[PDB]
Amino acid sequence: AAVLTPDVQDNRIRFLPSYLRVMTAGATSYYSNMGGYLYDLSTQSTTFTDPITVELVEMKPFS
Amino acid sequence: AQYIPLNANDDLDAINDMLAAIGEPAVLQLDEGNADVSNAQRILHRVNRQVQAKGWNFNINEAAVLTPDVQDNRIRFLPSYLRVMTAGATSYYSNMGGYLYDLSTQSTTFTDPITVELVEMKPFSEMPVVFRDYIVTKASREFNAKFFGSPESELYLREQEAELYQQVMEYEMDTGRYNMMSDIGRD
Amino acid sequence: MAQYIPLNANDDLDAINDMLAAIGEPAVLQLDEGNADVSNAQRILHRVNRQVQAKGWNFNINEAAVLTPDVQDNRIRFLPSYLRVMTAGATSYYSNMGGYLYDLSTQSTTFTDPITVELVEMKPFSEMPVVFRDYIVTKASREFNAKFFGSPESELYLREQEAELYQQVMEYEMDTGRYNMMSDIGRD
Amino acid sequence: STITQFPSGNTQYRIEFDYLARTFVVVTLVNSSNPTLNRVLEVGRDYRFLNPTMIEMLVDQSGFDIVRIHRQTGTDLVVDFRNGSVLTASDLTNSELQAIHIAEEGRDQTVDLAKEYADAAGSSAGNAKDSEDEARRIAE
Amino acid sequence: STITQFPSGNTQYRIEFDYLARTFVVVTLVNSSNPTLNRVLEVGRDYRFLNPTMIEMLVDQSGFDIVRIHRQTGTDLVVDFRNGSVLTASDLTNSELQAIHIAEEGRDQTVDLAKEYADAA
Amino acid sequence: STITQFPSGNTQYRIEFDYLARTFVVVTLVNSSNPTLNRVLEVGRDYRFLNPTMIEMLVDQSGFDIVRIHRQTGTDLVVDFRNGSVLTASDLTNSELQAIHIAEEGRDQTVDLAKEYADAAGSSAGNAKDS
């Protein structure tokens, strides 16, 4: 359970280079990167309007 | 401490890794260089285009509206198309003189928008990490094979490639649930 | 392009450059007829393309095709771009005899009304699906290496590459057609 | 092939030609009946890019029925050769492409106006030719 | 120039202008009386190349009187530069000749056609 | 532009476009009343160059009202490349410029030559049928 929030001026969500996997908990998912922004293949748009919850894996230092 | 890289790019590093197979040090720029830097890019591009065309769950689009022109009714065939098919049926589509051709009707005179299933291409620097590693290893094998035969550098890339292939498949299976017992219900 | 497909690319030049790579030499930069290698490579590429295109695929066979006889004399020509001539669902006896269509059943070359058959025509190289192009290039490279310059390490890899490409071509072929065996069946 | 038109009403449109920079692409709204009401759109407030081959509209398409996209290359030079420096392929490449592109727009522009008038002249010539010739041959 | 007309009823014809690739040549049979009677031939099925400057036709004439040949330059690159290769003069010559040919054709062709129609009238 | 209009009865004029050689510039006299004569001059005994941007004439007539000056580039390689020579920057620059020009030359005079040839052919057809 993690929460991502959109921007104010425009409606987009950034794709930081520290993300490794993005998936939905208990269903099929269609997520990918297109020009540094989050893309949803089902709707064919990048106009998220409200915060969503996803399943992801981040990177950690070697030590 | 930690490793903070200086001016990192996703193409220069890939070329540097492909060069490391032979045993030559890295570079700092790509505008000018010797032959090897000009020999690696062709192989990398070809391998990328080949691998991207198999068709995965995050490429295939089941609904896309191609539209005709207004002066002469026709549809162009851009060089970024990889597969053209119809979802729930058989299809006859091909290219003839840079235009869409339908073998069933033997004409190129579409009049209304059409919905098909196609797979487009993406730049190398937005694929998931595992795919990038797999592609780099695949390219490195051929680069070593066709220009400098070394046995020790070989016999290891194969072992790495098998594991990467397994990881690719196991990643792919988790994207879609694929439950067989769907749309089945009655007392 | 560093981030995308290069602008205005030439397919034949790329194919020749890829074929030269197996030997271990750099590009040729012009595709001219003066050089010895280009003339040798082009014939092999053309022959392999023609051989592979003639096997018969779902986007080649044209079930309904119309041929028409000449006016002055009742004959039909046999163009050099035809690859296979057959009837749809019955036995056929067709062949070429002096650049004309011959029917063994009737033992004559005279046709008086247009007929309908199926045939397979040839297409230019740069108008084929990608996997076919890669498969053809690999097959041509193997022969070019085998016939003009024997290298023992460039081998033992093109074989695996060819096998993988053959497999991929097979899955591509089995996807265009659905081929449901349980059609035409139904009753209470 | 550098000028294309599509029906109005949709939200996405496709780009179908190569370019050297993103400032060489022009988008305009066309009124078929009266061509004195055409307008030009500016990037940032009217349309945006997703990928190198697709855009989206953001303004109201009212009173308009065609949308036109065409390429317009500039004339200022791109590479500046100077004495005492290393020669590289990209400069040779970039310079070559710039020229081929311009010549293409020039031909595509001129043919449009040329062809119909040439055809009319040829048809009139042929009509006068055969009419007068065989008519007077039969007469005399 | 870039356009030529010859009387019909022969077996061989001459190519005089210059070209960079053998697929840039177009042949067409024209009928004077009927403007919409034109047809465009196609290589291999209608004609073949005897030598770099000779063509042999394999079709039968009829309601036609003049044979027309013109040039149409393509779009694809002829020379593609890469680091580490040998460079000579012919490369630099062709790289410019391509664009020059495109511009010359696009400027002249229709005007010459209008000229010949004009004096034919 | 590429085409320039100038009234007659004057001594000096100027040039309003770049060029690659003095032979490319073409100057002719125009008489609007009689389109058919439109005599064309030539170098040496009729006009002479002092300042590359200036034109200084030798002879004048008084039956003409306006003067025409326009550019016309030739379809030949100005620069030559050969083995053993040296590659400068001036030649490399001057090479591509040739093509960037011919484009505008076509763009302007193609259309308005089409009109003249077309209505000439039409008038020929008309008077051929009438007479």
PDB file of N, CA and C in Angstrom, chain B residues 69 71-72 74 76-78 97-99, chain C residues 8, chain D residues 1-6 14-19 68-72 100-101 103-112 115, chain E residues 72 74-75:
ATOM      1  N   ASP B  69      -7.335   9.832 -45.121  1.00  0.00           N
ATOM      2  CA  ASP B  69      -7.076  11.216 -45.493  1.00  0.00           C
ATOM      3  C   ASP B  69      -8.373  11.831 -46.016  1.00  0.00           C
ATOM      4  N   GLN B  71      -8.278  14.164 -49.115  1.00  0.00           N
ATOM      5  CA  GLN B  71      -8.182  14.410 -50.549  1.00  0.00           C
ATOM      6  C   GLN B  71      -8.328  13.108 -51.326  1.00  0.00           C
ATOM      7  N   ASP B  72      -7.410  12.174 -51.105  1.00  0.00           N
ATOM      8  CA  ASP B  72      -7.473  10.838 -51.691  1.00  0.00           C
ATOM      9  C   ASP B  72      -7.596   9.841 -50.539  1.00  0.00           C
ATOM     10  N   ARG B  74      -6.968   7.077 -48.498  1.00  0.00           N
ATOM     11  CA  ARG B  74      -5.909   6.088 -48.345  1.00  0.00           C
ATOM     12  C   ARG B  74      -5.356   6.196 -46.933  1.00  0.00           C
ATOM     13  N   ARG B  76      -1.610   5.619 -44.787  1.00  0.00           N
ATOM     14  CA  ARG B  76      -0.175   5.446 -44.925  1.00  0.00           C
ATOM     15  C   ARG B  76       0.328   4.339 -44.004  1.00  0.00           C
ATOM     16  N   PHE B  77       1.582   3.943 -44.223  1.00  0.00           N
ATOM     17  CA  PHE B  77       2.216   2.841 -43.499  1.00  0.00           C
ATOM     18  C   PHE B  77       3.545   3.353 -42.951  1.00  0.00           C
ATOM     19  N   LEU B  78       3.509   3.905 -41.738  1.00  0.00           N
ATOM     20  CA  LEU B  78       4.702   4.462 -41.127  1.00  0.00           C
ATOM     21  C   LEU B  78       5.702   3.352 -40.806  1.00  0.00           C
ATOM     22  N   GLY B  97       3.655  -0.401 -51.715  1.00  0.00           N
ATOM     23  CA  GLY B  97       3.979   0.963 -52.081  1.00  0.00           C
ATOM     24  C   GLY B  97       3.685   1.970 -50.989  1.00  0.00           C
ATOM     25  N   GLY B  98       4.020   1.625 -49.749  1.00  0.00           N
ATOM     26  CA  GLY B  98       3.815   2.521 -48.629  1.00  0.00           C
ATOM     27  C   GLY B  98       2.362   2.851 -48.364  1.00  0.00           C
ATOM     28  N   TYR B  99       1.496   1.843 -48.434  1.00  0.00           N
ATOM     29  CA  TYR B  99       0.075   2.034 -48.179  1.00  0.00           C
ATOM     30  C   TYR B  99      -0.498   0.729 -47.652  1.00  0.00           C
TER      31      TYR B  99
ATOM     32  N   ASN C   8      15.491   8.379 -42.739  1.00  0.00           N
ATOM     33  CA  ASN C   8      15.698   8.009 -44.136  1.00  0.00           C
ATOM     34  C   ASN C   8      16.740   6.909 -44.289  1.00  0.00           C
TER      35      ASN C   8
ATOM     36  N   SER D   1       3.449  14.653 -49.840  1.00  0.00           N
ATOM     37  CA  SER D   1       3.331  13.831 -48.642  1.00  0.00           C
ATOM     38  C   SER D   1       3.632  14.645 -47.392  1.00  0.00           C
ATOM     39  N   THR D   2       4.018  15.904 -47.586  1.00  0.00           N
ATOM     40  CA  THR D   2       4.320  16.804 -46.484  1.00  0.00           C
ATOM     41  C   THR D   2       3.129  17.657 -46.073  1.00  0.00           C
ATOM     42  N   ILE D   3       1.985  17.503 -46.733  1.00  0.00           N
ATOM     43  CA  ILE D   3       0.761  18.209 -46.379  1.00  0.00           C
ATOM     44  C   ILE D   3      -0.352  17.182 -46.236  1.00  0.00           C
ATOM     45  N   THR D   4      -1.050  17.213 -45.103  1.00  0.00           N
ATOM     46  CA  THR D   4      -2.121  16.266 -44.833  1.00  0.00           C
ATOM     47  C   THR D   4      -3.267  16.972 -44.128  1.00  0.00           C
ATOM     48  N   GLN D   5      -4.472  16.432 -44.307  1.00  0.00           N
ATOM     49  CA  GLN D   5      -5.682  16.994 -43.717  1.00  0.00           C
ATOM     50  C   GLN D   5      -6.500  15.868 -43.106  1.00  0.00           C
ATOM     51  N   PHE D   6      -7.134  16.142 -41.973  1.00  0.00           N
ATOM     52  CA  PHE D   6      -7.993  15.196 -41.283  1.00  0.00           C
ATOM     53  C   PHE D   6      -9.299  15.858 -40.865  1.00  0.00           C
ATOM     54  N   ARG D  14      -1.991  12.176 -35.559  1.00  0.00           N
ATOM     55  CA  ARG D  14      -0.720  11.507 -35.778  1.00  0.00           C
ATOM     56  C   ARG D  14       0.181  12.328 -36.692  1.00  0.00           C
ATOM     57  N   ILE D  15       1.485  12.212 -36.447  1.00  0.00           N
ATOM     58  CA  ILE D  15       2.510  12.849 -37.262  1.00  0.00           C
ATOM     59  C   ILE D  15       3.140  11.785 -38.147  1.00  0.00           C
ATOM     60  N   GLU D  16       3.276  12.102 -39.432  1.00  0.00           N
ATOM     61  CA  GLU D  16       3.590  11.099 -40.443  1.00  0.00           C
ATOM     62  C   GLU D  16       4.723  11.557 -41.358  1.00  0.00           C
ATOM     63  N   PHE D  17       5.631  12.379 -40.841  1.00  0.00           N
ATOM     64  CA  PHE D  17       6.819  12.743 -41.600  1.00  0.00           C
ATOM     65  C   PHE D  17       7.957  13.049 -40.639  1.00  0.00           C
ATOM     66  N   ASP D  18       9.186  12.921 -41.132  1.00  0.00           N
ATOM     67  CA  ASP D  18      10.354  13.185 -40.308  1.00  0.00           C
ATOM     68  C   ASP D  18      10.591  14.685 -40.173  1.00  0.00           C
ATOM     69  N   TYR D  19      11.343  15.058 -39.140  1.00  0.00           N
ATOM     70  CA  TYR D  19      11.693  16.451 -38.908  1.00  0.00           C
ATOM     71  C   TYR D  19      13.022  16.521 -38.172  1.00  0.00           C
ATOM     72  N   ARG D  68      -5.116  20.845 -40.391  1.00  0.00           N
ATOM     73  CA  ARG D  68      -4.007  20.681 -41.322  1.00  0.00           C
ATOM     74  C   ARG D  68      -2.678  20.686 -40.579  1.00  0.00           C
ATOM     75  N   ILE D  69      -1.780  19.791 -40.985  1.00  0.00           N
ATOM     76  CA  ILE D  69      -0.435  19.698 -40.426  1.00  0.00           C
ATOM     77  C   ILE D  69       0.552  19.635 -41.583  1.00  0.00           C
ATOM     78  N   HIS D  70       1.565  20.500 -41.561  1.00  0.00           N
ATOM     79  CA  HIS D  70       2.586  20.523 -42.599  1.00  0.00           C
ATOM     80  C   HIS D  70       3.929  20.921 -42.002  1.00  0.00           C
ATOM     81  N   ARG D  71       4.991  20.637 -42.751  1.00  0.00           N
ATOM     82  CA  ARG D  71       6.363  20.865 -42.316  1.00  0.00           C
ATOM     83  C   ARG D  71       6.924  22.094 -43.015  1.00  0.00           C
ATOM     84  N   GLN D  72       7.685  22.900 -42.275  1.00  0.00           N
ATOM     85  CA  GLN D  72       8.284  24.130 -42.792  1.00  0.00           C
ATOM     86  C   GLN D  72       9.694  24.261 -42.224  1.00  0.00           C
ATOM     87  N   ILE D 100      18.219  18.084 -48.544  1.00  0.00           N
ATOM     88  CA  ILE D 100      17.223  17.171 -49.173  1.00  0.00           C
ATOM     89  C   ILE D 100      15.837  17.587 -48.689  1.00  0.00           C
ATOM     90  N   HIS D 101      15.699  17.892 -47.403  1.00  0.00           N
ATOM     91  CA  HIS D 101      14.356  18.226 -46.868  1.00  0.00           C
ATOM     92  C   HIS D 101      13.811  19.436 -47.626  1.00  0.00           C
ATOM     93  N   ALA D 103      14.425  20.895 -50.534  1.00  0.00           N
ATOM     94  CA  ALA D 103      14.065  20.597 -51.916  1.00  0.00           C
ATOM     95  C   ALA D 103      12.738  19.849 -51.982  1.00  0.00           C
ATOM     96  N   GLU D 104      12.497  18.957 -51.015  1.00  0.00           N
ATOM     97  CA  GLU D 104      11.239  18.218 -51.008  1.00  0.00           C
ATOM     98  C   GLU D 104      10.036  19.143 -50.843  1.00  0.00           C
ATOM     99  N   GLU D 105      10.081  20.055 -49.860  1.00  0.00           N
ATOM    100  CA  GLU D 105       8.935  20.964 -49.734  1.00  0.00           C
ATOM    101  C   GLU D 105       8.776  21.816 -50.985  1.00  0.00           C
ATOM    102  N   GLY D 106       9.887  22.245 -51.588  1.00  0.00           N
ATOM    103  CA  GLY D 106       9.771  23.055 -52.793  1.00  0.00           C
ATOM    104  C   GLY D 106       9.034  22.336 -53.909  1.00  0.00           C
ATOM    105  N   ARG D 107       9.433  21.091 -54.185  1.00  0.00           N
ATOM    106  CA  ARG D 107       8.770  20.336 -55.246  1.00  0.00           C
ATOM    107  C   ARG D 107       7.303  20.092 -54.915  1.00  0.00           C
ATOM    108  N   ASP D 108       7.021  19.694 -53.670  1.00  0.00           N
ATOM    109  CA  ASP D 108       5.648  19.375 -53.291  1.00  0.00           C
ATOM    110  C   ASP D 108       4.756  20.604 -53.387  1.00  0.00           C
ATOM    111  N   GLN D 109       5.318  21.782 -53.123  1.00  0.00           N
ATOM    112  CA  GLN D 109       4.544  23.008 -53.254  1.00  0.00           C
ATOM    113  C   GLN D 109       4.264  23.314 -54.721  1.00  0.00           C
ATOM    114  N   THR D 110       5.294  23.247 -55.572  1.00  0.00           N
ATOM    115  CA  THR D 110       5.136  23.745 -56.939  1.00  0.00           C
ATOM    116  C   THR D 110       4.249  22.827 -57.784  1.00  0.00           C
ATOM    117  N   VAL D 111       4.320  21.511 -57.545  1.00  0.00           N
ATOM    118  CA  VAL D 111       3.600  20.569 -58.405  1.00  0.00           C
ATOM    119  C   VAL D 111       2.095  20.819 -58.330  1.00  0.00           C
ATOM    120  N   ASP D 112       1.612  21.178 -57.138  1.00  0.00           N
ATOM    121  CA  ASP D 112       0.195  21.385 -56.871  1.00  0.00           C
ATOM    122  C   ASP D 112      -0.387  22.431 -57.812  1.00  0.00           C
ATOM    123  N   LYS D 115       0.273  21.257 -62.059  1.00  0.00           N
ATOM    124  CA  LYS D 115      -0.235  20.112 -62.815  1.00  0.00           C
ATOM    125  C   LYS D 115      -1.554  20.403 -63.527  1.00  0.00           C
TER     126      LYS D 115
ATOM    127  N   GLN E  72      12.381  10.737 -62.295  1.00  0.00           N
ATOM    128  CA  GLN E  72      11.789  11.073 -61.002  1.00  0.00           C
ATOM    129  C   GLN E  72      12.720  10.560 -59.914  1.00  0.00           C
ATOM    130  N   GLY E  74      14.216   9.818 -56.166  1.00  0.00           N
ATOM    131  CA  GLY E  74      13.580   9.300 -54.975  1.00  0.00           C
ATOM    132  C   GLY E  74      13.794  10.164 -53.748  1.00  0.00           C
ATOM    133  N   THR E  75      13.661   9.522 -52.586  1.00  0.00           N
ATOM    134  CA  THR E  75      13.735  10.185 -51.290  1.00  0.00           C
ATOM    135  C   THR E  75      14.836   9.611 -50.406  1.00  0.00           C
TER     136      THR E  75
END
